[model samples]
Target chain A: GRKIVFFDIDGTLLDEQKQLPLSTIEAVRRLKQSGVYVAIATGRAPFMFEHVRKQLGIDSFVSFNGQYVVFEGNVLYKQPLRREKVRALTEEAHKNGHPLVFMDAEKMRASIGDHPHIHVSMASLKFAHPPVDPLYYENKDIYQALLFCRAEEEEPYVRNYPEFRFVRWHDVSTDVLPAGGSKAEGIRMMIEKLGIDKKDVYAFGDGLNDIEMLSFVGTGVAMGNAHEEVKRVADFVTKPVDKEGIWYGLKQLQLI
Target chain B: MGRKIVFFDIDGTLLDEQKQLPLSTIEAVRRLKQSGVYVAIATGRAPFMFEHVRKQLGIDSFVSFNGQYVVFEGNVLYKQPLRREKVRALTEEAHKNGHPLVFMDAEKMRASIGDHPHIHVSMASLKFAHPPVDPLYYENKDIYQALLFCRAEEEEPYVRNYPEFRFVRWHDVSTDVLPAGGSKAEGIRMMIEKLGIDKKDVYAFGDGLNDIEMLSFVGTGVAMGNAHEEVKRVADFVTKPVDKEGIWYGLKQLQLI
Candidate 1:
């Protein structure tokens, strides 16, 4: 009887100050009490949302850009790259001098630091850093790889491992995952597990990677600060992220 | 894909001997929801006692106290409390007969006689909290159901005297009394209507004589492998016993997994 609403983090929930505005928190709480199932659908790892998820009283979330799906604290579904695929891509990036970060169920394991995009993404997420060697991803359950490379530099991996998929979430890097993995697919799994009607599904996001998820839900909303491409396909484009965008979008949808 | 809604009976359909949900059952239920099926517990348990199990299974809808109450998303969809006069009469009868009983409202449960060993045994077996005995409990509250402590042989004449009600014995000391025509099916019907879902798309899994009406009312009725003969006879499908993945297998048979 409750409709499911998925939310993307960073520019979507955490404001310019990397804070969950009291208004946004109040809005989510009100909507939840009103029977709307508010959930997180973000590229961040599950661990990244530890406090945020609890603060919002969320029960389910799609993490790692949809490669990992967790519901009610248990992993409902996950798509880890084949060991060979991880080795192949890691070796390729190592050879090309591309700084890569391996994301497991926990924090991202990286060999290099001081990458501009890493700081940019981390600053936005209010995250700290850790340094690890390339071997950190070896024989591990690597769900995603944040390859610090431009679009033009993605050719080698795209040409070699056709089974791998790419979703560029940042200007300085791209998130790589096993084929068929996306936030939309993760939402599909969550929708099934939550027993919510597909037609009642709604999503809100503000990023290039949110395209698949935006188009997948019954109602896809793009934030005012969203990229041109993301806004082009969104059913509704609301106010900018820091300007109470989440609260505005929810209000327009009549969720709160 | 369309969302699927599943209703599960608590005792034999969802829990095993240890009163724990099997890991496999948990996985399947998780996947079922992950696949977009709305799941809820349809139990004879009271609303106050359902929070843990609902939270454990991540379910939000409930048809509790047989068909006497139903709730979804914090909304009270339906409530069919028993007439107070009947509860008062039953309390007097149980006291006169030296039989113990418990009266359950939406909130509290008050026993007619608390020190009886039979009452203690039945309450312990059902994991019901120790209810305080109060002679005037019914006068202050609207009871939805009553559990009478009586043997099966002693049940017939006792219920026969109350023509307006029916009794289903889940144990020797535990007999649930409801308005003559009330049942779990009645609660489910209200839940489906409020959810805006079709009765033909619903599935109910149960494993007892009390479940016969529920199984018969749903679109696909499944009996656990360890169900009563009459329960199996009335069910449209039968699956392995609770210990053998009955809920998981039944959902698989329906391709819900």
Candidate 2:
């Protein structure tokens, strides 16, 4: 029997400045030495955190907010956006001047070159505005797409594109994923493959994107810096990331 | 006082997967130089590795060895070689573990073991032949960086034990070991300070794990469309893929050309 812990990247393993704290680094290294299987669960694409994965010596991950999953660097499962539905949404968004960025497991590309909403949202993530390629989704399996529009502008899409799941990660950017796709589903695929019982699983996260991941794990630890709603649902709350939250949380759980 | 500077990462940013420099990129660089913007190379490659690229682009300034060495306008501006004692210890441990090591200085690189497949594969990707054997290459020279060749799983112990060094994986079996906290960002910072360039006027384009800090540290960070998602996430803009006129498009978007 093996126990596994999944960690979210933003606000959990890394601080706002995207720097990994010394405390977090030591804690992760120690945890790995102790033989607990460690993995990352994030809304980020698989290629997004390869450096962090290497630094932490982790090969398993649930990426694209759970539409894609990998175990030991081998992809275990994937759920991509429906092509026809995506095409329809692309047309609709284009009519309304809303920008869309298509995402596969490896990369993302924008539907247009210049959009303040796209720049603002990407900058918020400390990411760049994607290259413009309106037909990027053609003949490709898109795991996720970023729909850049004001919150109010999302209502019509939500009403019309009920087949797709729209989750807001930024004020002007919403993650457009397949209906019912989530990190929980991705984790379930991983655990099922490894034959690990749910009771021995653990997770730590601190954002809206992490809600499903934290809740699905047996011991969900939310960072003190987590949103109030995220904190409310956690089995336990630890110190902030900068304050050694991961170390403290694992200590409290007696996993270290 | 508002002089502009742009740093370009070599692999994946400037060269395609086949290790060929794109024609559009050559044109973009030429146009950029004509506009009076300062251009420099920021790369994980050592100075010797990209000398041809420097000559081809007609640029001299560069941050090499992941910022362990920086040269501005053909003059050495900074140097932070790996500690000899730490390298000695690492060498001993890697040799014991049957993993080969490559010690690199400003001039050239040498391997710790005769001929290993890991070294061959990784170097070939860079269009270089396997380096000659020189097990104790770090004995007296200022080694700026080292390449530790081993499987991904085999790097865990080294990573855990070597707290003084940072390991960045570039290939399946190859990882770069640099001084802890050393990165292209640090090298760029040294150049900007020495040249009196404002942060707001400094720009960088890169497309690898080593480029993350560099992209974040500059005023304008551009990631190639083919860059890793994390790299793109930290960039101000993502141009096309290297073969797709990425450099030209990025410069055009920034009005640098």
Candidate 3:
């Protein structure tokens, strides 16, 4: 029986430089061949991952932190930004020096560079792509947007709008999504489609953003290198990233 | 004597190429001056023309058959066509020169030449302000004026043949053969005398060769963009290029608008 192993990019499948670890790359290939239905749910622009997507041989990419759900390059679901939220966020981002990247249920565009942590993070994370000028990227009809910063530079989005959801991934990246969206949302959609029971599902993560996802899953595992807060929420904590945590986590879960 | 006259030349003046005035323009003219300007239509058209042309534009004063027959405010100025003897004399002379002639009389109307051509509408066009008429209907109508719209070579011989019949030769729908000096000028002159308006205070605006005689008589004459070179040369003032609202501009410049 094939198991749907929902993999996170950065700290989970990718190393510190956001490079896909050989282990994760090989693991994805094996999983895909096994007909496990490997789906990538990420905060990255959906198209930006075309290379990694092709490399991982994953056929599905759910982007904008689950605002969009696509299968094998065909868009299966879409949601535009609610205009009122755009007006509010536009005013706030313009007033503060905070950089912003907009997302739609479909595409994503960033007008400003992220904070130092985010800059250091994506500079290494995004550098592997075929030459991309972050500024040159634009899609006029964007609905969702991601706000990024260093832990110091970052402020809670909830103080201004508590109804909206914000999840911190790298101390650098936070997936700013619709009030009702998450990687878990995309997973639930997959569950409904595959007719898989919720208890049979599994997810592993390493950040505050992964809290809801890990808690929502039937068996939640945390990376050893994962944040202490995430480790606390996870049903089980595996060894840190350098320690082959994913391999060990799989073994412990009897997934391998 | 006090009744006002508005002489609107049909082709390239009041009406455009297709001869349909825009709805807005019709509105601008319809009932505009009320009884002030006393809009009378003076065209080369014959009597009781175009069914579509309403009296809304003060077509009450119709001077059709050029100015030869001026129906002033619906009253005939002079109901005169060519004399039958004059017509006979021209017909005989035209036969001598191997030239054909068409005669337009109020009572009996048909072409002296063969069946009509497209340019025949050139006359009816000026009549109804270029109103749309079914082709069969127009081709079959008893035309009041027998326009000698023949080949260029034939026109000269035909005019030379018909000395007894007076003919004015202008281009396009040229040569109105009637009693000598059967011009819009003669008709407008009769109208002028009837109105008692002094020539100095009078203003005439034109953009065609047909309007040249009228232009000479007007105290202040204006010409449009496409005004014939001779008309423009004689015109007191010339406006912008034809179809460029030159007439409107002329009125604006004169503070007439």
Candidate 4:
């Protein structure tokens, strides 16, 4: 019987400052030392959290909110967005003066330059605005697209485009992914490949995108600072990330 | 002959995403000073909170607490403490609602409660530890601004009840309470008048809700690429994001450096 744990990056692994806590690094190292399988599940592109993965020595992850999945340095599964739909969405967003960021496993590129929404949201994740490439999605297998607009502005897209799911990770940014994609699906692919039982699966997250993963996992832990909605769906709520939420949650679950 | 003055917001203007000053911004400020342009800070942060930034930039003038406190060339030029009676009333109301408040003066800040998650989270984002607890710090001090720790929905009642104070959200769990109609514009105006700088020569760059008035009041309001949509809309020009050498780009566009 194998055990696997999935951890969200922002507000779960990293504190409000977007910096990894010493205790968290220690906790993850200890978990590895104890032979627990640790992986990351985040809405970020693979290139975004490379530093975090390197620091924690984790190679397996469900990135792009589940559109792309990797296990032990190998691609487990990936679901790229519909290219035609992305083109239409980009046109509409451009007409409405909104910006978008196309993300793949390798890198991300922005649809426009000098956009406040893109700048603010990207900066929050400690990233500079990606180089502008409006047609970047035209060629590559795009996994996720970031739509930069107010909460109210996303309604039309959500209503019109049922093929995609819009999850708000920031106040002014939403993650656009394939409707059928989710961290749970990505985890399912990984666990099936690794022959791990669902009963031994655990996840820790703090954002709206984590709702499905939290619900699907056998033991889902929500950070104390997680959104109220995310907390409600979790099996357990641990301390805030700043207070060593991951470390405390793993201890409660007897993983380390 | 009209001289030029530029006001910079700290958090998202001069500082990068990590709350660290970008080397580009430091160099830009140095070049601006050499070019004979006046440089000052306009931010929601307190004077003590940005002491290192001020020293690093060699800037002595600032509009701290979103204009409630103003210093010019290392001298206090203006001070506007909140109405004592109003703060007392608001404190009691917030206390009853289970919300905490942090009373801030020019020197230091003190929290009403011993410890709260909201206070801890918000203060840490600014790269500062939580202030010492002193519930009655406002009793004998000239408190310029108060940080109210609560959700956005929890602020409506206070906003409706407190007409003398303006509530501006800076974090998910914190809002800055300042005098009604007070803004960085008010403080900047005071400095410009004293220096006899014309309105056309005043420039500013900002990226937050509190910076709206400051950007609108300046002759050339330059909004950062990371600024709120409303801020960008009101600004005369939009520059790149702070983390992308926005300060340097904006100054270059304005020919100030």
Top-down DockQ ranking = 4, 1, 2, 3
User: Comparing only chain A of model 4 with the true chain A, what is the TM-score?
Assistant: 0.88
Candidate 4 residue-wise lDDT, A29-99, digit = tens: 66866878889988778877775675466889998878889988898887788888999999998999889
lDDT of 3 by residue, A172-207 (tens): 666566676777887787767767766877776776
Tens-digit per-residue lDDT, B101-207, candidate 4: 99999877899997577886787666444566899999999899999999998999999999999998979999999999787788888888878899999999989
RMSD of 1: 20.7
Best by TM-score: 2
Q: In candidate 4 chain A, what residue range of length 10 has the lowest lDDT sum? A: A122-131
TM-score of each: 0.48, 0.59, 0.40, 0.51
Error of 1 at B188 (Å): 1.2
lDDT of 3 at B82: 57
Tens digits of per-residue lDDT, candidate 3, B1-257, equal 44344455665665545444333333233323433554445567554343224322335565568766676655666655556554555556554654444554442234444423433444333321112223222134333354445445557755675665555554454456655567776777777677775665455567788788777776667777787899888888887643566555665565445
Per-candidate local distance difference test: 0.78, 0.84, 0.57, 0.85
The all-Cα superposition gives candidate 3 an RMSD in Å to the true structure of 30.6
Deviation in Å, model 4, residue B144 alpha carbon: 53
User: What DockQ class does candidate 1 belong to?
Assistant: incorrect
